[PDB]
Scaffold this active site. Sequence first.
Site, short mmCIF file in Angstrom:
data_model
loop_
_atom_site.label_atom_id
_atom_site.label_comp_id
_atom_site.label_asym_id
_atom_site.label_seq_id
_atom_site.Cartn_x
_atom_site.Cartn_y
_atom_site.Cartn_z
N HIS A 107 0.81 -1.22 0.00
CA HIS A 107 0.00 0.00 0.00
C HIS A 107 0.84 1.27 0.00
O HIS A 107 0.29 2.37 -0.10
CB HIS A 107 -1.01 0.01 1.17
CG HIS A 107 -0.41 0.12 2.55
ND1 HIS A 107 0.00 -0.97 3.28
CD2 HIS A 107 -0.30 1.19 3.38
CE1 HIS A 107 0.41 -0.57 4.48
NE2 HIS A 107 0.24 0.74 4.56
N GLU A 154 0.18 -8.24 0.03
CA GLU A 154 0.59 -6.99 0.66
C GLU A 154 2.10 -6.77 0.71
O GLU A 154 2.55 -5.82 1.36
CB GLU A 154 0.04 -6.87 2.09
CG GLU A 154 -0.12 -5.41 2.64
CD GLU A 154 -0.57 -4.39 1.59
OE1 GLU A 154 -1.26 -4.80 0.62
OE2 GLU A 154 -0.28 -3.18 1.75
N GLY A 167 2.55 4.80 11.18
CA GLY A 167 3.97 5.04 11.28
C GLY A 167 4.80 3.79 11.45
O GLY A 167 6.03 3.87 11.43
N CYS A 197 4.27 0.87 9.55
CA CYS A 197 4.20 -0.03 8.41
C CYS A 197 5.57 -0.21 7.77
O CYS A 197 6.39 0.72 7.73
CB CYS A 197 3.18 0.47 7.39
SG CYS A 197 1.53 -0.08 7.82
C1 LIG Z 1 0.75 1.48 8.07
O1 LIG Z 1 0.60 2.15 6.84
C2 LIG Z 1 -0.59 1.31 8.71
C3 LIG Z 1 -0.56 0.58 10.11
C4 LIG Z 1 -1.99 0.40 10.77
C5 LIG Z 1 -2.39 1.58 10.90
C6 LIG Z 1 -3.15 1.72 12.41
N1 LIG Z 1 -2.51 0.87 13.11
C7 LIG Z 1 -1.66 -0.09 12.27
O2 LIG Z 1 -0.98 -0.97 12.70
N2 LIG Z 1 -1.43 0.47 7.86
C8 LIG Z 1 -2.81 0.66 7.48
O3 LIG Z 1 -3.39 1.58 7.89
C9 LIG Z 1 -3.51 -0.33 6.57
C10 LIG Z 1 -3.42 0.04 5.14
C11 LIG Z 1 -4.11 -0.97 4.21
C12 LIG Z 1 -4.16 -0.48 2.69
C13 LIG Z 1 -3.31 -2.29 4.23
N3 LIG Z 1 -4.92 -0.36 6.98
C14 LIG Z 1 -5.34 -0.74 8.32
O4 LIG Z 1 -4.51 -1.03 9.12
O5 LIG Z 1 -6.73 -0.76 8.58
C15 LIG Z 1 -7.16 -1.07 9.88
C16 LIG Z 1 -7.68 -2.51 10.00
C17 LIG Z 1 -6.68 -3.65 9.95
C18 LIG Z 1 -7.16 -5.09 10.08
C19 LIG Z 1 -8.65 -5.41 10.27
C20 LIG Z 1 -9.65 -4.26 10.33
C21 LIG Z 1 -9.17 -2.82 10.20
#
Ligand SMILES: *[C@@H](O)[C@H](C[C@@H]1CCNC1=O)NC(=O)[C@H](CC(C)C)NC(=O)OCc1ccccc1
Length: 188
Positions: A40, A71, A145, A147
């Site tokens: 992503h 991913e 932050g 990822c």
């Molecule tokens: C890094 O870019 C970030 C890390 C997430 C952000 C909040 N806490 C973390 O560990 N990744 C994302 O935001 C990720 C992006 C997608 C395009 C892969 N989306 C995400 O984490 O959505 C929340 C979620 C994850 C798993 C199940 C339900 C909701």
Amino acid sequence: GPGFDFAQAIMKKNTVVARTEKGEFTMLGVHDRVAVIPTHASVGETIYINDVETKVLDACALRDLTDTNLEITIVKLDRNQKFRDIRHFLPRYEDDYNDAVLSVHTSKFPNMYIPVGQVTNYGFLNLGGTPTHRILMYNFPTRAGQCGGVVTTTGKVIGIHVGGNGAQGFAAMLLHSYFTDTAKHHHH
Ligand SMILES: *[C@@H](O)[C@H](C[C@@H]1CCNC1=O)NC(=O)[C@H](CC(C)C)NC(=O)OCc1ccccc1
């Protein structure tokens, strides 16, 4: 306890700060000029590596034979430095793991170690709207932050962090066979 010494050796020699249009990501270098980043991140034709613009010579967004997102994107970079070859630290197979460490390397967090405890082979996850396979899970409240963050046990580099729902965090698996010299095929 957790393998802090191992995580630190991996961060020291094999991570860089990568910045795309989507922001900054920890980036794990695997061998030669080949590294990985969460898909992503939306890698394009050029990328910032430690704030230096760098030509992206190849980018392969991994998907499995069900045509499902893994991913992980593998990139080949136009840089002079070679990465230490850490392929022998990658797991051969899917697995569960004990007492892992998540390590981050960004501008905001230049080196950062988080013990996440147990890591389970979770499998399918709807990752913020994208169906994804081969996911590893840990019960830790990971945050934006992080990822790209490298997930390790001692002697094994097992995945990179890609998401989190507020209670658990999620990494995409790294498998040894993702990085072996293989065949001649048209992939774009
Ligand atoms: C890094 O870019 C970030 C890390 C997430 C952000 C909040 N806490 C973390 O560990 N990744 C994302 O935001 C990720 C992006 C997608 C395009 C892969 N989306 C995400 O984490 O959505 C929340 C979620 C994850 C798993 C199940 C339900 C909701």
